[PDB]
Structures are given as structure tokens and as C-alpha cells.
Design a protein around this nucleic acid. Structure first.
Ligand SMILES: Nc1ccn([C@H]2C[C@H](O)[C@@H](COP(=O)(O)OP(=O)(O)OP(=O)(O)O)O2)c(=O)n1
Ligand SMILES: [Ca+2]
Ligand SMILES: [Ca+2]
Length: 424
DNA sequence: TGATGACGCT
DNA sequence: AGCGTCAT
């Protein structure tokens, strides 16, 4: 009763760019705007592997992890943009720079946690308190939430009509008299996220979606409910009905083996069904941490903090060498390690200038024909010849080949990663 | 025929 | 340390 915590203490948002690499290329090439289009890496195997797809192309059934040649069979007029290729590999710099544009805008509003190249969490709790104080108690107009969905509402045959009826039901029952109402706090949060999304679009050209809720898992789930170019508020109150038919795999961290295990062992399908189990039962099946997390999460409660981190903690680059293209000579392994090391050196030097830090450890990881081995060594100089030589040094005993000159068994992946940053 | 990045476990 | 899971 009076002592049951309800996970309503924070206002958390997740902001995710719509079809992000596609928008970067459409911004640059207006001919691609408002068209079915995709971004592809490489070009020679089946037209290239699709890694991002515009919403217009999705309407034809085009997805990522399709080959371009196959996507063209579903969508003959599909337009393509190719990822930059440098030193014989895909080069994601354009997308990393576009990412910085968006992250730097978000950070003007609140401290952010960079979750991927195109999304970030935001803890808006303080910003909301402030805005609430700034508002004497004026009601919140629907005009301040022009792209917001209230999950579970309403209670019209056009999508925008539904959106508005839902929003009206929400605002008409909101208690503005109480500065401590969690629902009021989420609503103000959504006003701020409208402002943040407007600034991102105005200053970059990019559209995004967002989720606003009381923790990161519900914000992330909320974000995906109305895409593209919209945002979704998931209140604590909305959780029982939302979770009652929500497959377990949709919740962040449950989309893999653990979630599969929850479904198999407990004989359930939906997040809501977890409420029937004691915390001890879940801990017994899935371990102390996972069981506690599940017990709370199925009730809409999660305490994972928005971490104050807007820069990546590692800088890496890798290349696959599949099938017949696997690396089978030593000079080959050396040459690719050098290409990787050269890209890594460029990115590290840039990073050192921009962000006042230096990496101190080099991780080298490989795969053998059908992840292989990982070995580390000191990163003491941003020098590509030295890093590639050192990477070779620590992986060279992997070679079972006796008289070579040669590399057995052939290498199907190479990976260099700079880590353990210190201030500089 | 893919290229990344964060974090948990022992 | 090195390996594994989960995700974009
Ligand atoms: N397996 C993946 C998934 C994504 N990306 C890249 C291309 C995407 O544009 C970008 C962001 O990934 P998202 O999963 O957020 O997908 P999009 O932003 O492309 O689409 P959505 O609008 O559905 O978020 O990261 C990638 O290289 N490999
Ligand atoms: Ca996205
Ligand atoms: Ca994303």
C-alpha cells in the first residue's frame, strides 16, 4: 500500500532518428527525398547489403539484411546510396559526424546517454521540475503536444483523429494543481521532447521519434510505438494493458536467449504474465540480478540510470573476409591489419583533438574459418604502422600453418579496437 | 559474403 | 584477462 514503490520517480526519454543513414544521404542528395531508397555497403555482391531503408521503400517490403538485387525485385524503382569506401572497407564517418550534430543539440536540453549512433536517452526529471515551476499552473494546451500519442487512449476513422482524441482525453483528466503528479511530470516531459525534436529538425533537417516514460526500457518501447516522426507517452497507468499482449522479446535485453528462456521455462508469451511469479521464483530461474529486474520490469518499474556519457568509450574497426575471400597468406593478414590500423589512427587522432583523451589499450580480435580470439597490447603511439605490427605480433601464434609464408586456418574477420581512454 | 558498440561473467 | 550476450 503506502510503502509500495511504483517506479514513477523519473522522467526519461529515448530519442531515435528515423531511418537514420537514409536521412543523412537524402539531406545530402535532394533527389533521394520522399522516395523509396536504401543505403547499401559494397556493391559487387548482389548489388550490396542493405543497411537502412526509407519508410517509402518499407511499404514495398524492403528490409535491412536484404541484398540490393533482391530488394529491387520487390521495389524496381528503389534508389540506392552507397556507404563511402576507404582503404578497401566501408567507412562510416559521414554517419558518425551526422550523429554528433544531433547529440550536441540534445545535450543543450539535458544530460544524455549515447545509446547508439542514432539514439540517446535523456533524464528530464530536473528540466521538468523547472518548467513546472515556470508555469504558475496554466493548463497544458494540446497545441504544445502536436506530434504526441498517449498510449492506451482514446478510451474517428483517421490516424490523426485518433491521436487527438486520445490526447484530449489525457489533458482533460490531467491534475495540474499537483506539481508532484507523475502523469503531469510525464506530460511536461513530452512538451520538452516536442521542443527538442523541433530543434533537431530545424537545425539538422533530420526527423526522429521519441518515447517518454519513467525509465529507459519503457521510453525505448514507447519510441517504437508510433514511428516515424512522432513521439509516444507511456504512463505508469498504461502498463498493465500495454504489457498484457506484449511479446516478451520486444522488451530491451529480452530479445535474445534470456527472453527465449523466460518463455520456455515459464510457459508464457507476454510481459504481463511475469507478474504471476514471486521475485524468488524468477531469481531461481534466471539468477539474482535478472530475476529482480524481471520482477520489477513486468510491473513497469526499472532503475537503470541515464548515464552521463555522450561519447563512445571504444573506437573500433573491423572487416569480414567470408567464404573464398578468407585471408590465407601472411602478407595478406599484414596488409589488411595495416588498412584497419590506418583508419583507426585517423579516427583516434581526430578523437584526441576533439575530446581531450587518449586510448591506452589496443584490442585485436580475429575469426578463423568455420569469436575466434581476442588479445590486447599497449597502445602507446597513434601510429598505424606500429599498431598493425603490434596486432600482428599478438595474433601470429594463431597460425597453425607449418611452413608459411602462409596462414592456416584462413582468417574470416579482423578487428582492431582502441580502448581504456585517459584524459589528455 | 557487414560494421559497429556496451556491458555481464568468471 | 578473455569470452559471451544483446543491440543498432
Ligand atoms: N544492424 C544494423 C542496424 C542499424 N544500422 C545502422 C543503419 C541505421 O540507419 C542506423 C540506426 O539503426 P536503427 O535500428 O535505429 O534503424 P533506422 O534508424 O535505420 O530505422 P528506424 O526509423 O526504424 O529506427 O544504424 C546498421 O548499420 N546495422
Ligand atoms: Ca533509428
Ligand atoms: Ca536506433
Amino acid at each position: 500500500g503506502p510503502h509500495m514503490a511504483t517506479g514513477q520517480d523519473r522522467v526519461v526519454a529515448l530519442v531515435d532518428m528515423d531511418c537514420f543513414f537514409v536521412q543523412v544521404e537524402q539531406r545530402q542528395n535532394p533527389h533521394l527525398r520522399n522516395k523509396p531508397c536504401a543505403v547499401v555497403a559494397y556493391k559487387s555482391w548482389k548489388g550490396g547489403g542493405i543497411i537502412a531503408v526509407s519508410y517509402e521503400a518499407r511499404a514495398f517490403g524492403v528490409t535491412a539484411s536484404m541484398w540490393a538485387d533482391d530488394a529491387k525485385k520487390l521495389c524496381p524503382d528503389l534508389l540506392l546510396a552507397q556507404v563511402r569506401e576507404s582503404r578497401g572497407k566501408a567507412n562510416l564517418t559521414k554517419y558518425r559526424e551526422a550523429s554528433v550534430e544531433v547529440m550536441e543539440i540534445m545535450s543543450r536540453f539535458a544530460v544524455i546517454e549515447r545509446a547508439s549512433i542514432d539514439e540517446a536517452y535523456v533524464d528530464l526529471t530536473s528540466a521538468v521540475q523547472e518548467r513546472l515551476q515556470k508555469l504558475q499552473g496554466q493548463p497544458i494546451s494540446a497545441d504544445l503536444l502536436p506530434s504526441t500519442y498517449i498510449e492506451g487512449l482514446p478510451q474517428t476513422v483517421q490516424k490523426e483523429g485518433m491521436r487527438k482524441q486520445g490526447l484530449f482525453q489525457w489533458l482533460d483528466s490531467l491534475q495540474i494543481d499537483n506539481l508532484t503528479s507523475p502523469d503531469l511530470q510525464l506530460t511536461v516531459g513530452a512538451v520538452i521532447v516536442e521542443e527538442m525534436r523541433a530543434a533537431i529538425e530545424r537545425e539538422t533537417g533530420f526527423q526522429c521519434s521519441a518515447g517518454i516514460s519513467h525509465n529507459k526500457v519503457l521510453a525505448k518501447l514507447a519510441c517504437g510505438l508510433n514511428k516515424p516522426n512522432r513521439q509516444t507517452l507511456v504512463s505508469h497507468g498504461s502498463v498493465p494493458q500495454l504489457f498484457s499482449q506484449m511479446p516478451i522479446r520486444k522488451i530491451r535485453s529480452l530479445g535474445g536467449k534470456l527472453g527465449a528462456s523466460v518463455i520456455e521455462i515459464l510457459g508464457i508469451e507476454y510481459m504481463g504474465e511475469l507478474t504471476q511469479f514471486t521475485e524468488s521464483q524468477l531469481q531461481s530461474h534466471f539468477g539474482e540480478k535478472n530475476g529482480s529486474w524481471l520482477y520489477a520490469m513486468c510491473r513497469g518499474i526499472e532503475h537503470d540510470p541515464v548515464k552521463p556519457r555522450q561519447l563512445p568509450k571504444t573506437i573500433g574497426c573491423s572487416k569480414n573476409f567470408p567464404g573464398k575471400t578468407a585471408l590465407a597468406t601472411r602478407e595478406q593478414v599484414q596488409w589488411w591489419l595495416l588498412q584497419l590500423a590506418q583508419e583507426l589512427e585517423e579516427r583516434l587522432t581526430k578523437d584526441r583533438n576533439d575530446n581531450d583523451r587518449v586510448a591506452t589499450q589496443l584490442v585485436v580480435s580475429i575469426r578463423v574459418q568455420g569469436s575466434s580470439l581476442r588479445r590486447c597490447c599497449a597502445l602507446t603511439r597513434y601510429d598505424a604502422h606500429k599498431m598493425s605490427h603490434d596486432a600482428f605480433t599478438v595474433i601470429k601464434n594463431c597460425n597453425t600453418s607449418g611452413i608459411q609464408t602462409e596462414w592456416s586456418p584462413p582468417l574470416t574477420m579482423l578487428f582492431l579496437c582502441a580502448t581504456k581512454f585517459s584524459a589528455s
